[PDB]
Amino acid sequence: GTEHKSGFVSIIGRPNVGKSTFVNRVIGHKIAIMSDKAQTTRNKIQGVMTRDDAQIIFIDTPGIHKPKHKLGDYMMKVAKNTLSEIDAIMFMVNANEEIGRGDEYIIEMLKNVKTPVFLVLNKIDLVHPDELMPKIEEYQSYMDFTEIVPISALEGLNVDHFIDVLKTYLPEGPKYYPDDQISDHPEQFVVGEIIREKILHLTSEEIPHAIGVNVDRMVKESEDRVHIEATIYVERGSQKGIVIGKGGKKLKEVGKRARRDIEMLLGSKVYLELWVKVQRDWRNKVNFIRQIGYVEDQD
Ligand SMILES: Nc1nc2c(ncn2[C@@H]2O[C@H](COP(=O)(O)OP(=O)(O)O)[C@@H](O)[C@H]2O)c(=O)[nH]1
Ligand SMILES: [Mg+2]
């Protein structure tokens, strides 16, 4: 059934295990704006895999392979949060090497994580087929995994099957990054769709319910802190009370919930400003926008 899936996955593992090889294989042609414009939030979008039936956004976690003295108290909190918000974890491991401390350090960080962890044995091309099941068993002694999938990221052996399996674990969801619009960085579409989801929870309906979200600005204030301006657009000012509510109470709750989901996923602390505006037809028209709503969220 023809029902579109989308989500956030993080590819974790020690250096030289194949993470960028995998990313660059599956994502296809690299998005141009991602190397013009730097991303304001912390947790870097690696790229966008779009098939007809699904879209996956690859997010960087912090270096959970690192020992605790190198990745501090704060960047652990960011890493554990990001791993919860994410839809799936790709734990990528070298088939051709013995288990080092870096993989034990990752296993420690995945202990009280409830997100699906996929064990991806990479570099199976450097190894006899009968070597895979013993190595799988080495890792299974440490923890349970959701699926175990041997690949070669370089050759492409078993990659498409891995993606088919990975897609089954995604929720139903929007195409975050579209084909029409090359101009803005995909982080803006991630924030835009998060805001929109919080609005559509309130609607919760099959009254025909048209609402839009624009993100007017995203600005890095610090390595932790980002300022988002966004305008929610509605038809009909009587949509106050779906969206603004009794003295702004409903718009605060949207602002609070969207701020949290942006902080947890993308790893930067936010100062969110939301506007709510009514848009009538604009083509050859004067005074088609009336504001009905403003909120401010932080700390
Ligand atoms: N033989 C083999 N080499 C691979 C495979 N995947 C990646 N490599 C190579 O192993 C290295 C891994 O580096 P990279 O992909 O940058 O991994 P990262 O540090 O995890 O991003 C590169 O020299 C890749 O060409 C694979 O499946 N088989
Ligand atoms: Mg590398």
UniProtKB/Swiss-Prot annotation:
Protein origin, superkingdom: Bacteria
One Gene Ontology molecular-function label: ribosomal small subunit binding
Location of region: G1: 13-20
Chain spans, region G2: 39-43
Subcellular localization(s) per the UniProt record: Cytoplasm; Cell membrane
Binding site for GTP: 13-20, 60-64, 122-125
Chain residue ranges for the region called G4: 122-125
SUPFAM superfamilies, per database record: P-loop containing nucleoside triphosphate hydrolases, Prokaryotic type KH domain (KH-domain type II)
Positions of region (G3): 60-63
Stretches assigned to the Era-type G domain: 5-172
Membrane topology, record value: Peripheral membrane protein
Keywords: Cell membrane, Cytoplasm, GTP-binding, Membrane, Nucleotide-binding, Ribosome biogenesis, RNA-binding, rRNA-binding
GO CC term, one of those recorded: cytosol
Chain segments carrying region G5: 151-153
InterPro entries per record: G_ERA_dom (IPR030388), GTP-bd (IPR006073), GTPase_Era-like (IPR005662), KH_dom-like_a/b (IPR015946), KH_dom_type_2 (IPR004044), KH_sf_prok-type (IPR009019), P-loop_NTPase (IPR027417), Small_GTP-bd (IPR005225)
Residues in KH type-2 domain copies: 203-280
Pfam families for the chain: KH_2, MMR_HSR1
One GO BP: ribosomal small subunit assembly
Major localisation: cytoplasm
Subunit structure of this chain's protein: Monomer.
Family: Belongs to the TRAFAC class TrmE-Era-EngA-EngB-Septin-like GTPase superfamily. Era GTPase family.
Physiological role: An essential GTPase that binds both GDP and GTP, with rapid nucleotide exchange. Plays a role in 16S rRNA processing and 30S ribosomal subunit biogenesis and possibly also in cell cycle regulation and energy metabolism.
Protein name according to UniProt: GTPase Era
Organism: Staphylococcus aureus (strain NCTC 8325 / PS 47)
Higher taxonomy: Bacteria, Bacillati, Bacillota, Bacilli, Bacillales
Gene label: era
